[PDB]
Structure formats: structure tokens, C-alpha cells
Write a protein that binds this ligand. Structure first.
Ligand SMILES: COc1ccc(-c2ccc(C(=O)N[C@H](CO)C(C)(C)C)cc2C(=O)O)c(C(=O)Nc2ccc(C(=N)N)cc2)n1
Ligand SMILES: COc1ccc(-c2ccc(C(=O)N[C@H](CO)C(C)(C)C)cc2C(=O)O)c(C(=O)Nc2ccc(C(=N)N)cc2)n1
Ligand SMILES: [Ca+2]
Length: 223
């Protein structure tokens, strides 16, 4: 997260870190056994880390649970980036508590201009790299479809939206991928792609979760 702020420990209790001996992507807890992330974060050896603030220090509220299943959307396309969504099942159920809690799925899509909370442990600089110990947060609005398509001509599908700041300086970034965009208590987005980070006229692009609620529910019911 570039241009964000320190969230505060366990203030975003649905935020998970996907770990393979290091943090590589975010995710969002949606019930005690399932995490929503980005398809492009798929890999072997995933451990889900819940209850984290400082990802480099044991602080006492963590739960580390191996992924037993990783289910990428059936029509994910790694070229176009359409349908950049994956469901991860935990090998055993998390213990839900105040610091490890789920986020609601949308019942309807959010309007342009809706203010959302984006969070993660990704890079915090727009040039160069700095990776934070503690979770970072950014308030950012959803942009209009027209502004999004103007920013990325020919690239924006009905399963994507843009969010952020066209002046630059405030964006998600590498390592935030798979993590949440939460608006009025609903998981509306997944950190997906962009051009660099926090560049002028190049807002973040996010998977549009409201198109996937039936798929998510049916997938959880069958796996
Ligand atoms: C598929 O969609 C996107 C969208 C954006 C990026 C991206 C993000 C940040 C940056 C980047 O500029 N990140 C930091 C920001 O400070 C640097 C300091 C490393 C430049 C670069 C890229 C890129 O396009 O190469 C990427 C991206 O990083 N893709 C990528 C693909 C292949 C390799 C590899 N085999 N070496 C590495 C990286 N992918
Ligand atoms: C869509 O498919 C992919 C595939 C791979 C990447 C990617 C490439 C390199 C890396 C990366 O450089 N990872 C390092 C290790 O080299 C970390 C230390 C951040 C784990 C991260 C990512 C990522 O998924 O976030 C990314 C990727 O760069 N995504 C991304 C997400 C958001 C923005 C933005 N809002 N500005 C920019 C870029 N996207
Ligand atoms: Ca920790």
C-alpha cells in the first residue's frame, strides 16, 4: 500500500497473509474455512496466516493453517486478467474470534464513488521498494467505468473496476494482490493489477467480487 497509513493491530480482522516462507499475497476470510484471494496468487505450499499485524514477529493472536485446496475461477485468463479470483480452503477451521473474523460478500455491486478500505503488506513506495512489518490501510474510492476505461483502454472487462487517486501517490501495490477492497462492510474488490504503483492516471484495478457471489457460494457448498 503506497500513501496509506498503519491500520492498527487486528483492526482488519478478515485480512489474511498468504505465506510460503515469506508473505506473497493477501486474502480475505469469508468463513472459518475459506479465504478469497486473486487467481494470479495461485502457487503450491500456501500457508494462511490469520490474526496478523507484524508479519515478522509472533505477537500472540496468529493462527497459521495450511491451505488444503486452491480453486481458481474456471474462466480465469492470465493474459487478459479476467476473473482474477480464487478460493482457498483451510486444512482445518480457523477459530473465529475478535481478531480473526470474516467479511460479508456483497448483495449488490457498489456505485462509482463509493469509499472503500484497501489493506495489505505490499510495497509502500511508488519508486523503489519498502515492505512493511505491520498492516497498511488506504481509504480509496471506486472510479467510474468511463474513467477506468480511459486509464486502461481495451483492458477493462465487466469483472474489473478501478479505485484510487488519479494524481498518483495513493494505491495498492505488489504484495497487496489478493487482498480486500471493503466498502460499507462488503468485500467488493480483490487487489488484482495496475501499472506500476501509485502513478498518475494509472489507478488500481480490482476484481469485481459482486459478480462472483453465486460462484463463491456454490464452490464452498461443493468443496
Ligand atoms: C500482470 O500484471 C502486472 C501488472 C503490474 C506489474 C508491475 C507492478 C509493479 C512494478 C514495479 O514497477 N514495481 C516496483 C515498484 O516500486 C519496482 C521498484 C520493482 C519497479 C512493475 C510491474 C511490471 O509490469 O513489471 C506486474 C508485474 O510485476 N509482472 C511481472 C511479470 C513477470 C516477472 C518476471 N518473470 N520477472 C516479474 C513481474 N504484472
Ligand atoms: C495480475 O497478475 C499479476 C501477476 C503478478 C504480479 C506480481 C509480480 C511480482 C510481484 C513481486 O514482485 N513480489 C515480491 C517478490 O519479488 C513481494 C515481496 C512483493 C512478495 C508481486 C506481484 C503481485 O501479485 O502483487 C502482479 C502485480 O503486480 N499486481 C499488481 C497489483 C496491484 C497494482 C496496483 N494497484 N498498482 C499493481 C500490480 N499481478
Ligand atoms: Ca505476527
Amino acid at each position: 500500500i503506497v500513501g496509506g497509513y498503519t491500520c492498527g493491530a487486528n483492526t482488519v480482522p478478515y485480512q489474511v497473509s498468504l505465506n510460503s516462507g515469506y508473505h506473497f499475497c493477501g486474502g480475505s476470510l469469508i468463513n472459518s474455512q475459506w479465504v478469497v484471494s486473486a487467481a494470479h496468487c495461485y502457487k503450491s505450499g500456501i500457508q494462511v496466516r490469520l490474526g496478523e499485524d507484524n508479519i515478522n514477529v509472533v505477537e500472540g493472536n496468529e493462527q497459521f493453517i495450511s491451505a488444503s485446496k486452491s480453486i481458481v475461477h474456471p474462466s480465469y485468463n492470465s493474459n487478459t486478467l479476467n476473473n482474477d479470483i480464487m478460493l482457498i480452503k483451510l486444512k482445518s477451521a480457523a477459530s473465529l474470534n475478535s481478531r480473526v473474523a470474516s467479511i460479508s460478500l456483497p448483495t449488490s455491486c457498489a456505485s462509482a464513488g463509493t469509499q472503500c478500505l484497501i489493506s495489505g503488506w505490499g510495497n509502500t513506495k511508488s519508486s523503489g521498494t519498502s515492505y512493511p512489518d505491520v498492516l497498511k490501510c488506504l481509504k480509496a474510492p471506486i472510479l467510474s467505468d468511463s474513467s477506468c476505461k480511459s486509464a486502461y483502454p481495451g483492458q477493462i472487462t465487466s469483472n474489473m473496476f478501478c479505485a484510487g487517486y488519479l494524481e498518483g501517490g495513493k494505491d495498492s501495490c505488489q504484495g497487496d494482490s489478493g487482498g480486500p477492497v471493503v466498502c460499507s462492510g462488503k468485500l467488493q474488490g480483490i487487489v488484482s493489477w495496475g501499472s506500476g504503483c501509485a502513478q498518475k492516471n494509472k489507478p488500481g484495478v480490482y476484481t469485481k467480487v459482486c459478480n462472483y457471489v453465486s460462484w463463491i457460494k456454490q464452490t464452498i457448498a461443493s468443496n
